[PDB]
Design a protein around this ligand. Structure first.
Ligand SMILES: *[C@@H]1O[C@H](CO)[C@@H](O[C@@H]2O[C@H](CO)[C@@H](O[C@@H]3O[C@H](CO[C@H]4O[C@H](CO)[C@@H](O)[C@H](O)[C@@H]4O)[C@@H](O)[C@H](O[C@H]4O[C@H](CO)[C@@H](O)[C@H](O)[C@@H]4O)[C@@H]3O)[C@H](O)[C@H]2NC(C)=O)[C@H](O)[C@H]1NC(C)=O
Ligand SMILES: *[C@@H]1O[C@H](CO)[C@@H](O[C@@H]2O[C@H](CO)[C@@H](O[C@@H]3O[C@H](CO)[C@@H](O)[C@H](O)[C@@H]3O)[C@H](O)[C@H]2NC(C)=O)[C@H](O)[C@H]1NC(C)=O
Ligand SMILES: *[C@@H]1O[C@H](CO)[C@@H](O[C@@H]2O[C@H](CO)[C@@H](O)[C@H](O)[C@H]2NC(C)=O)[C@H](O)[C@H]1NC(C)=O
Ligand SMILES: *[C@@H]1O[C@H](CO)[C@@H](O[C@@H]2O[C@H](CO)[C@@H](O)[C@H](O)[C@H]2NC(C)=O)[C@H](O)[C@H]1NC(C)=O
Ligand SMILES: *[C@@H]1O[C@H](CO)[C@@H](O[C@@H]2O[C@H](CO)[C@@H](O)[C@H](O)[C@H]2NC(C)=O)[C@H](O)[C@H]1NC(C)=O
Ligand SMILES: *[C@@H]1O[C@H](CO)[C@@H](O[C@@H]2O[C@H](CO)[C@@H](O)[C@H](O)[C@H]2NC(C)=O)[C@H](O)[C@H]1NC(C)=O
Ligand SMILES: *[C@@H]1O[C@H](CO)[C@@H](O[C@@H]2O[C@H](CO)[C@@H](O)[C@H](O)[C@H]2NC(C)=O)[C@H](O)[C@H]1NC(C)=O
Ligand SMILES: *[C@@H]1O[C@H](CO)[C@@H](O[C@@H]2O[C@H](CO)[C@@H](O)[C@H](O)[C@H]2NC(C)=O)[C@H](O)[C@H]1NC(C)=O
Ligand SMILES: *[C@@H]1O[C@H](CO)[C@@H](O[C@@H]2O[C@H](CO)[C@@H](O)[C@H](O)[C@H]2NC(C)=O)[C@H](O)[C@H]1NC(C)=O
Ligand SMILES: *[C@@H]1O[C@H](CO)[C@@H](O[C@@H]2O[C@H](CO)[C@@H](O)[C@H](O)[C@H]2NC(C)=O)[C@H](O)[C@H]1NC(C)=O
Ligand SMILES: *[C@@H]1O[C@H](CO)[C@@H](O[C@@H]2O[C@H](CO)[C@@H](O)[C@H](O)[C@H]2NC(C)=O)[C@H](O)[C@H]1NC(C)=O
Ligand SMILES: *[C@@H]1O[C@H](CO)[C@@H](O)[C@H](O)[C@H]1NC(C)=O
Ligand SMILES: *[C@@H]1O[C@H](CO)[C@@H](O)[C@H](O)[C@H]1NC(C)=O
Ligand SMILES: *[C@@H]1O[C@H](CO)[C@@H](O)[C@H](O)[C@H]1NC(C)=O
Ligand SMILES: *[C@@H]1O[C@H](CO)[C@@H](O)[C@H](O)[C@H]1NC(C)=O
Lengths: 103, 132, 440, 125, 125, 125
């Protein structure tokens, strides 16, 4: 089960809106999780099953599935959200991830 | 749940490394029907991250009966176990190469049917360095 | 012009969950069959037509309910039995005589100082224990479960042999049974028939091979939830049984030890005759043919040009790595590497070594552990074998050689095979329809 | 036939053999089996009694088929009578009315009560 | 009289004292006495409900005695009315017709359902 | 309104909202809470069954308000009809006739039995 993530990296200023795309070569249903890792910090879940918020995460992240395409909307970005986002499916993990930093 | 982890480690190539992840007061659940404590069916996943690149999945241990399952390309050199009495999980990685140096995370999975492969709580991460 | 009218006795059902009761047709046994209401000799099975119902074996409530029910039966059965707290004492253990090369240190001759009838004088008493049941500190050994959980000895009178039990929903409820032989795990089942009681369900206890199960009516069947998932166990159901014997050739003799005023503990006394390893015999040709059938039916889910490799268990506790099952009253843990060794690509009988444990803690419960009583004489138990619990190991996308190993462990997956074709429905005998009538 | 025999059949066949399943709506220590069976039996009696309550409040006690005096509001289902009674089985009909039961139930009881009151006022003369 | 008072009496007396012996068909820890009492009460309720449902199927609910629409086949019994109602006790009659009970019950059930369907069809006008 | 809404109201007002409060007459291991809940459920069912049977014996099963055939002896209460139907509440009326309650039940039962026997005799011809 191959999993790819786009874009490799992206940047946005404070308070903007961003999206991250995850493409799965197979139809894995809604079982998609996304994980955010701040630099020098173990990652913590924020969205599970691709449309239900994790415990203790702000509501500015909203997931969405369109077929094999998966993405979530990040609104009103604030500068504690700079880090690396990874989309994981089943056993596989997205190589690289997406680095988000302010410009 | 709190996931304490062992301290940083340095080993030599070709040796073995042992990493311990502790999850106190989380191996047992309540079965209100019988009204007795049981060992939960949670999965202790193990993840690794090389410096610079994204995370990778080594294996997981279902602690109900010590069932395990490793990744394909690590098989034959990684052994995963847990101790229910100590409520801990042990990763034993053998024959480390130069490229195996990295930070290892232990992850907790409630093994809920609705949410497959979900990790809630993560350990502080143990950095293991291999060199001569 | 139209008016509503109610219709009692309407044939309308809904999905629901409700407690169901046992029913078996007639010695005390661990399943309280003496408490089950007797079942009628001829169940009034009713075929249906033109009716399609969605079935979801993996979200079925019956399996979880019956697992809880079995746990309760087990706990309540062993509750009024002799305690074994005093056995947690220092043991002087020596290696045991006429033993082959497969019993080097397996059996330990352990003596202790259990109290006599009156609780004032100690008496030196010897017994035999299996090496998996002692821990070192001649040398000193202690019972393995003497620092984690208390031990209770099952009463020797009650038997653990599985006995078929029929599940009957209460009045106003029905059990829908899917007769579609090609019906896989989840989906609509066009040929569904109602019934009041389930067929003979044997609450067997096994981990890797579904002993004494129910056979599929057509070619071997594979079932899974999200078979793409690695974790989800891959249920198998054989069309044709694979005979298996799994006997113990020793002749251990029981001995009673008075550990208190009335409470007696049974210990493995002297063994008459020599000592040989317990083994399982499987006819190689039949197992090979069954594996060929299962790989033929398994290639469908992955492709015709894929490679399937059967490997032994990955590892873990003794009850998962080896095939663990009850027989006659003795628990067996049998090396299964002999079977899952093939590498399928596009007369003689195989023998599996076995070991015997006496402390059993299935459905791990923090605080209690059963001491299996010894069984006198040789024990033989022919078993049919009906299904396997395989799990697909992960694989890098570059390669196309899927490896299957006999995992399992959880008894819910074990029991989902026996209730794979059953559902519970609540009848709703009230309905409203338009009609030309108009009540006076 | 037998219990739930016409479950998949059309409206007409089911509406002719109700009583085959109406009659099958009703058919020691404190161990696990004992308490389980007792709860099952009590629950079955309670469900049948709630059903009897709903039937009695509509003034159709003891009748498998009874008629009412309220209009069939087309907002529920404005479909042709013949196609309803010759095409759709009871299950699909329920799946197309399940959203609209409570209201009609209430209507029934209200009408019934009103009717009873009126009847009483008629009989006092 | 009282409960079961007319048990030895003939048909004439018994068929007029139904209510007096139908009035008494229905009248906390987990101790042995407690569980026995609870099971007894549930059993009484279940028996009453079974009888009442059987009455309701034959369209005679709420009536002590009701008339039906199927005739008395002489195969069941050839005894004439007069000696039946002035000569033998209820228990004797029950023992005489006990082994014929299921088929006559089925006959009443089918006839009541058919009569209800016919009445509905007639009322459709 | 809802359950018990018009309890303190007049007979005239309360005698038209029977259904709204008659509808609400019917609405695990062996732990203390479980056994208490089970006992409560079976007790509620038993009480309702007693009341329903008492309705059924007087030939009013399935009727919220039924008319009878037993005369109202003025010894029970000689008050004018309009007075008791326009001023009192139901609680006061029940308190007034509390001690005159078994006698009227017996009279009702005998009257219904006699009426049923007469109806059967008439239906014979
Ligand atoms: C899968 O299903 C198969 C069914 O074929 C099970 O096989 C049964 O296993 C049980 C467990 O051992 C067997 O029970 C034993 O049978 C012995 C043979 O009994 C026969 O022969 C004697 C004369 O020698 C007759 O008197 C008797 O009536 C039988 O005709 C018995 O000797 C054993 O006795 C022991 O238990 C009894 C209580 O049951 C004690 O009183 C005795 O003292 C002694 O301790 C025992 O009864 C059984 O025979 C097997 N076959 C059948 C057809 O039942 C598998 O066990 C099962 N596997 C799993 C995993 O569930
Ligand atoms: C486990 O260990 C116990 C303890 O040694 C064994 O029981 C003992 O077996 C010996 C066998 O020689 C008994 O010796 C006796 O010797 C006399 C003559 O000295 C002889 O007449 C007797 O017939 C018997 O052979 C001994 O009494 C007996 N008990 C004790 C307390 O020592 C037991 O056999 C061992 N079991 C196994 C399976 O090895
Ligand atoms: C694998 O699992 C997923 C979810 O665990 C299934 O996706 C469906 O998700 C919706 C979400 O609203 C549920 O309502 C459905 O019940 C799910 N389907 C099933 C069959 O359970 C997905 O279908 C599963 N199978 C595959 C092949 O992806
Ligand atoms: C109970 O006793 C057992 C037996 O000694 C303990 O298990 C051993 O623990 C040591 C601790 O370092 C390990 O080295 C051994 O490998 C363990 N033995 C086995 C067979 O696994 C266990 O830890 C004790 N439990 C408690 C709570 O004290
Ligand atoms: C079990 O059979 C059902 C039959 O409907 C399968 O459900 C669909 O089957 C069609 C074709 O057979 C597929 O195109 C759909 O993708 C299936 N839907 C879902 C939700 O699975 C079902 O897939 C079968 N399951 C297994 C494990 O074989
Ligand atoms: C297994 O041991 C038992 C117990 O001794 C044997 O049963 C009896 O053994 C005694 C001697 O120990 C003999 O005298 C009896 O004749 C035996 N009873 C019989 C044969 O019914 C039993 O024979 C032993 N099993 C084997 C295979 O030898
Ligand atoms: C299981 O199979 C083994 C195969 O070796 C059997 O062992 C032989 O059994 C015969 C029976 O008379 C003996 O003569 C031999 O000495 C045994 N060993 C060997 C190496 O042949 C064993 O008996 C079988 N057991 C069951 C229960 O089927
Ligand atoms: C398992 O044991 C059974 C019973 O001992 C074996 O079945 C019998 O085997 C013998 C020896 O060939 C035959 O004569 C019998 O006809 C077989 N059936 C019965 C009912 O006795 C069976 O072969 C064994 N399984 C193996 C060795 O794999
Ligand atoms: C599964 O098979 C492997 C080899 O095919 C077994 O590995 C051997 O394990 C024993 C002790 O467990 C060692 O002494 C050997 O050196 C191992 N050899 C190899 C090649 O790994 C493994 O034990 C088997 N597991 C089970 C549960 O049967
Ligand atoms: C289970 O059976 C396998 C069969 O291969 C055993 O593996 C062999 O064990 C012997 C020890 O008697 C070693 O000398 C061999 O090197 C092993 N071979 C392989 C391929 O592993 C194994 O020991 C048995 N027991 C367990 C627990 O797996
Ligand atoms: C299932 O459907 C079939 C066809 O939809 C039903 O067959 C009808 O049977 C009646 C009884 O003789 C005929 O009058 C009709 O003409 C048949 N239908 C057609 C289209 O010809 C059948 O009755 C339905 N029910 C069952 C239980 O099979
Ligand atoms: C099993 O059968 C296959 C062909 O069906 C054959 O190639 C193989 O040698 C047989 N034996 C084993 C142990 O696989
Ligand atoms: C095993 O399967 C066969 C298949 O016909 C069946 O006859 C038998 O009863 C089953 N059980 C045993 C113990 O043989
Ligand atoms: C008992 O039988 C006699 C027969 O002469 C009858 O007169 C009497 O009434 C019977 N007893 C009762 C209580 O009916
Ligand atoms: C209470 O008393 C007032 C006084 O007239 C009356 O209008 C009303 O209907 C009575 N009942 C309720 C429920 O308010």
């Amino acid at each position: 089960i191959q999993v790819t993530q786009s874009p490799s990296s992206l940047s946005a200023s404070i308070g903007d809106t961003i999206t991250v795309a995850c493409e799965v070569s197979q139809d894995v249903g809604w079982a998609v999780n996304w994980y955010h890792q701040r630099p020098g910090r173990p990652p913590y879940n924020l969205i599970y099953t691709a449309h239900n918020l994790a415990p203790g995460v702000a509501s500015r992240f909203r997931g969405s599935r369109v077929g094999t395409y998966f993405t979530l909307t990040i609104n009103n970005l604030l500068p504690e959200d700079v880090g690396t986002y990874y989309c994981q499916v089943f056993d596989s993990f997205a190589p690289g991830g997406t680095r988000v930093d302010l410009r | 749940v709190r996931l304490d982890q062992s301290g940083t480690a340095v080993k030599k190539p070709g040796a073995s490394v042992r990493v311990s992840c502790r999850a106190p007061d989380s191996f047992t659940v309540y079965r209100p029907r019988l009204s007795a404590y049981f060992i939960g069916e949670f999965n202790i996943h193990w993840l690794r991250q090389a410096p610079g690149q994204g995370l990778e999945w080594l294996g997981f241990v279902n602690i109900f009966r010590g069932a395990v399952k490793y990744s394909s390309r690590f098989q034959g050199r990684i052994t995963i176990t847990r101790d229910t009495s100590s409520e801990t999980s042990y990763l034993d990685l053998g024959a480390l190469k130069a490229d195996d140096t990295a930070t290892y995370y232990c992850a907790w999975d409630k093994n809920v049917d609705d949410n497959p492969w979900r990790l809630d709580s993560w350990g502080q991460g143990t950095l293991v360095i291999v060199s001569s | 012009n139209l008016w509503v009218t109610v219709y009692y006795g309407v044939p309308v059902w809904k999905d629901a969950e409700t407690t169901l009761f046992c029913a078996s047709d007639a010695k005390h046994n661990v399943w309280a069959t003496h408490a089950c209401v007797p079942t009628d000799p001829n169940p009034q099975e009713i075929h249906l037509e033109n009716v399609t119902e969605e079935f979801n074996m993996w979200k079925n409530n019956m399996v979880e309910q019956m697992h809880t029910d079995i746990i309760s039966l087990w706990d309540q059965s062993l509750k009024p039995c002799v305690k074994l707290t005093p056995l947690c004492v220092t043991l002087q253990c020596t290696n045991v005589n006429n033993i082959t090369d497969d019993m080097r240190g397996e059996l330990k001759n352990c003596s202790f100082n259990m109290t006599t009838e009156l609780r004032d004088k100690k008496q030196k008493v010897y017994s035999l224990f299996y090496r998996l049941d002692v821990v070192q500190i001649n040398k000193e050994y202690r019972l393995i479960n003497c620092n984690t959980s208390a031990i209770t000895q099952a009463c020797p009178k009650v038997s653990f042999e599985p006995i078929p039990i029929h599940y009957c929903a209460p009045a106003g409820f029905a059990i829908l049974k899917c007769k579609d032989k090609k019906f896989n795990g989840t989906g609509p089942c066009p040929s569904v028939s109602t019934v009041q009681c389930t067929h003979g369900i044997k609450p067997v206890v096994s981990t890797q091979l579904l002993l004494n199960g129910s056979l599929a009516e057509e070619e071997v069947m594979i079932r899974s939830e999200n078979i793409t998932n690695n974790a989800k166990n891959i249920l198998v159901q054989f069309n044709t049984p694979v005979q298996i014997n799994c006997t113990r050739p020793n002749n251990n003799t029981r001995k009673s030890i008075r550990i208190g005023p009335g409470q007696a503990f049974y210990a493995t006394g002297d063994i008459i005759g020599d000592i040989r390893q317990a083994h399982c015999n499987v006819s190689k040709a039949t197992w090979n043919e069954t594996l060929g059938k299962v790989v033929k039916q398994l290639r469908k889910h992955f492709g015709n040009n894929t490679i399937i490799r059967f490997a032994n268990s990955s590892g873990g506790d003794l009850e998962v790595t080896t095939h663990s099952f009850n027989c006659g009253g003795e628990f067996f843990y049998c090396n299964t590497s002999g079977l899952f060794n093939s590498t399928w690509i596009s007369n003689d009988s195989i023998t599996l070594p076995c070991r015997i444990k006496q402390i059993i803690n299935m459905w791990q419960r923090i605080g209690q552990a059963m001491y299996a009583p010894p069984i006198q004489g040789v024990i033989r138990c022919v078993s049919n074998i009906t299904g396997l619990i395989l799990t697909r190991d992960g694989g890098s996308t570059n390669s196309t050689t899927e490896t299957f190993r006999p995992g399992g462990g959880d008894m819910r997956d074990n029991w989902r095979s026996e209730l794979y074709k059953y559902k519970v429905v609540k009848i709703e005998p009230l309905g409203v329809a338009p009609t030309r009538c108009k009540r006076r | 036939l037998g219990f739930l025999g016409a479950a998949g059949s059309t409206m007409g066949a089911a509406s002719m053999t109700l009583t085959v399943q109406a009659r099958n709506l009703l058919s020691l220590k404190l161990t696990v089996w004992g308490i389980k069976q007792l709860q099952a039996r009590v629950l079955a009696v309670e469900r049948y009694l709630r059903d009897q309550q709903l039937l009695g409040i509509w003034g159709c006690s003891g009748k498998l088929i009874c008629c009412t005096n309220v209009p069939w509001n087309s907002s529920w289902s404005n479909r042709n009578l013949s196609e309803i009674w010759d095409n759709m089985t009871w299950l699909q009909w329920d799946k197309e009315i399940s959203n609209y039961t409570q209201i009609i139930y209430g209507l029934l009881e209200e009408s019934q009560n009103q009717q009873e009151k009126n009847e009483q006022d008629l009989l006092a003369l």
